[PDB]
Design a protein around this ligand. Sequence first.
Ligand SMILES: NC(=O)c1ncn([C@@H]2O[C@H](COP(=O)(O)O)[C@@H](O)[C@H]2O)c1/N=C/N[C@@H]1O[C@H](COP(=O)(O)O)[C@@H](O)[C@H]1O
Ligand SMILES: NC(=O)CC[C@H](N)C(=O)O
Lengths: 202, 252
Amino acid sequence: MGMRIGIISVGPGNIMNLYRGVKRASENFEDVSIELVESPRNDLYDLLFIPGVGHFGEGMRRLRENDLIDFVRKHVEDERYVVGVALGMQLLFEESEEAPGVKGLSLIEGNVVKLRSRRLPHMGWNEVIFKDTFPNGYYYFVHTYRAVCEEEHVLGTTEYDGEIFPSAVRKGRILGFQFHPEKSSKIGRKLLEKVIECSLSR
Amino acid sequence: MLAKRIIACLDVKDGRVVKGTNFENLRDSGDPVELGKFYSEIGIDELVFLDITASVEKRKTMLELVEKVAEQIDIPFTVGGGIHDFETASELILRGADKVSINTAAVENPSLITQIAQTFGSQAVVVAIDAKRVDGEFMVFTYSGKKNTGILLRDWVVEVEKRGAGEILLTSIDRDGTKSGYDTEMIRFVRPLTTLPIIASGGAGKMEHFLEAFLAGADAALAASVFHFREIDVRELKEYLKKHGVNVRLEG
Ligand SMILES: NC(=O)c1ncn([C@@H]2O[C@H](COP(=O)(O)O)[C@@H](O)[C@H]2O)c1/N=C/N[C@@H]1O[C@H](COP(=O)(O)O)[C@@H](O)[C@H]1O
Ligand SMILES: NC(=O)CC[C@H](N)C(=O)O
């Protein structure tokens, strides 16, 4: 009955920020444990986070070398919650202009393209409007590339420099967030708590 | 739409916030971690920790502070003050800082900007620029606002963008700590020269001054004195800015 949360910790980027944000979100829950995940030699988690800040190609490389791709697929196929954050959200798709020819996790149909603004990266607080579930408001962003997906998979939208893009995505129990909830003050904590709750209640 | 940012700058000495504050509600008002948490709680958008310390023990004390802050803080924070090389910048970012702010060492070795950006991305690099009118010209000053480099502000702003900086922290040495207002002429001067985000710094004393900085083209407004002595309430300031048409982050 205890809940096991896993956070893939191979990087690139500072993954400990998300670890600390998730255990902050977890303080009012008992019997919830959080583990750093760097290999597939573990039982499946109830909730698996894929974080990262960096190049799409380096994100996929580290998932490949540490034998975590099939581990991630096992969670999807067993209807456990898989949540990509920042680069991790982009890895959910099939490919990205950032890393030509590199295959992503391909868990959600679509691809990743450069934002149109003359000022990149998109960096700062921007508003996210959710279709449901998660709280509308301002979250902290830092990214140059964006997802392109079908409307049914769009969960939240944000406008930057005239361009509306998916700041959050959902396919079944696969969630992606383009922003950093662990750097989004109070509303980021309420979002991470809501993710935990989504996986506790089915 | 992106929010115009309100940034608090905390002067730290020996791992403590200089003077302490006027926040007797806190268990310790000179503790950088507790004070940063308080600012996140009241609506500050980003923090700058500025190490004005003079110990021989300074690199370790800054690393201790970054580790203490990264453990508990839930908003982005920049660290600056005496970051002299890639090696120092790297240890600070790896310990948990979202950005490093460099000034003197960037002027004396502009390739340091590119070195950090090439490992950590341009978003990790803030170049602090201290500038002053000299003979009718805006000049760049190093060594704590002290040394006229002979370099023109317009040349340096452009060079800073070419080297790969992510953001400019623009301080007018004439206005620093005066509570008389930001140097909106200098902000207007810099705005068309670069497409980088500009943090206005130095002089904030009243709510109108933050509005002036945004009208002048700043993407963010930073203050220290007005927050340290509790003269401006962050939520009241954000409410004032929103009534005057500024897109700020103001949550219910
Ligand atoms: N207080 C000090 O003794 C000090 N010592 C060094 N600095 C600056 O820090 C930077 C040092 O960077 P390096 O050269 O070491 O890289 C430089 O900008 C120095 O000038 C110092 N500046 C402190 N406060 C300045 O005044 C502003 C706040 O204004 P206020 O709202 O009106 O209160 C801040 O953004 C700062 O620009
Ligand atoms: N800042 C990041 O590394 C985010 C992921 C990706 N590199 C992007 O820019 O969109």
